[PDB]
């Protein structure tokens, strides 16, 4: 029983096949109160909760190297999204959980990693994608991957509408294998939650 239940605000998620959580680059957050915000930043806890996003269909035909990515933050239709439209500057980290649920009779292996400052990777570079915070998902072992990362970047605060620091990436390491008893394919979903949300610079009304 590798039973883990994560909580973010009024939302919870529990897995019975976890392999732990991978913390990336740091285990804490840098100082969220720097000179660049004067004293005007504030924390908006109502945004620290899970939202969902479909990633892709893990099918037998997708080979090693097949890669799907999701640049964060992404389109949000909740309070987080409203924040992005109401404040000039924000910062937050991410608590990511990804599911690739098929069954024990499937085979293959996915690599899920959080990458800072994305750039399309050369196929040779894919062999070294493990230098980034990551975790694997292999049907014989687990159905969930969980990574937690801090905010980072050259600016203590950002303008998400112009730059996306983190970008989630899931890639086929070994192709999915199916048998008569396995799931025919595996839909991969993401359950993400922003952490330590801070905003600064109240923008005007659009009216």
């Amino acid at each position: 029983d590798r039973l883990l239940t994560t909580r973010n605000g009024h939302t919870t998620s529990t897995t019975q096949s976890s392999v732990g959580v991978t913390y990336g680059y740091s285990t804490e957050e840098d100082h969220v109160a720097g000179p660049n915000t004067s004293g005007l930043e504030t924390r908006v806890v109502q945004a620290e909760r899970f939202f969902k996003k479909f990633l892709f269909d893990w099918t037998t035909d997708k080979p090693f190297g097949y890669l799907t990515k999701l640049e964060l933050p992404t389109d949000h239709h909740g309070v987080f999204g409203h924040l992005v439209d109401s404040y000039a500057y924000m910062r937050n980290g991410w608590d990511v959980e990804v599911s690739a649920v098929g069954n024990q009779f499937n085979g293959g292996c996915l690599l899920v990693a959080m990458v800072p400052e994305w750039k399309a990777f050369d196929t040779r570079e894919k062999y070294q994608l493990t230098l980034f915070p990551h975790q694997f998902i292999s049907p014989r072992t687990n159905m969930t991957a969980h990574i937690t990362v801090p905010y980072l970047g050259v600016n203590r605060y950002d303008q998400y509408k112009k730059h996306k620091p983190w970008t989630l990436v899931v890639m086929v390491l070994s192709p999915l294998t199916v048998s008569n008893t396995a799931a025919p394919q595996i839909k991969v979903y993401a359950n993400i939650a922003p952490t330590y949300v801070h905003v600064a610079g109240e923008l005007p009304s659009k009216e």
Partner: protein, 221 residues
């Protein structure tokens, strides 16, 4: 024998801002005493703080006039030391010699009206991120802002906060820069009573944490 020494290539050239001193040639001169001479200043910002100077509006006046019509936006300008409105201030005069800055810039509004002229104003800092500054107090109200009315006290001071991604900002503006990188300041007139034609003088000064770094000689010579 004598001391071996390697004269290194790459070193020794004169550099206009070097940290050395020349060799002297005319020694023993005692200057006339200048003890306690008045008006000395040792840091530009000390004066930049103590002596506020005027912004430039419209025709080229250091003030804003109360609108008699239905428009409430008295004035609007880029939060930039290179702003047109800031072009005559001592603050910008200094700023041109530095590459970057950070800190608070303070604005001062001084009503010039008659004893029977009354008004209520509002100043707001519109951070960057919006396409165009709001021409309405109602829309601007959602920003960091302050309102104040006319009375016994003629001056009202407001601090424009430093809020940006980077810790510092450029004092200059690049030609590719469409919208001002640091946002705008909007001054509105909520209302007035018999205040037509009366004036509002606005000036600016450095705040307690205003800072300029990286000296630069940019003017055409």
């Amino acid at each position: 024998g004598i001391f071996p020494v390697a004269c290194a290539d790459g070193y020794g050239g004169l550099v206009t801002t070097d940290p050395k001193t020349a060799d002297p040639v005319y020694g023993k001169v005692y200057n006339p005493p200048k003890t306690n001479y008045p008006g000395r200043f040792t840091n530009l910002l000390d004066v930049a703080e103590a002596c506020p100077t005027f912004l430039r509006f419209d025709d080229g006046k250091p003030y804003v006039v109360t609108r008699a019509d239905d428009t409430r936006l008295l004035a609007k300008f880029d939060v930039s030391l290179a702003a047109k409105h800031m072009s005559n201030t001592y603050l910008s005069g200094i700023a041109q010699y530095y590459t970057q800055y950070s800190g608070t810039i303070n604005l001062h509004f001084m009503f010039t009206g008659s004893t029977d002229s009354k008004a209520r104003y509002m100043v707001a800092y519109i951070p960057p991120g919006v396409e165009t500054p709001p021409d309405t107090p109602e829309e601007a109200a959602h920003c960091i802002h302050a309102e104040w009315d006319t009375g016994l006290n003629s001056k009202f001071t407001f601090s424009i906060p430093y809020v940006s991604a980077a810790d510092y900002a450029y004092t200059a503006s690049d030609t590719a820069e469409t919208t001002n990188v640091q946002g705008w300041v909007c001054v509105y007139q909520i209302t007035h009573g018999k205040a037509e034609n009366d004036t509002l003088l606005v000036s600016a000064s450095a705040g307690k944490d205003f800072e300029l770094r990286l000296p630069i000689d940019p003017r055409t010579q």
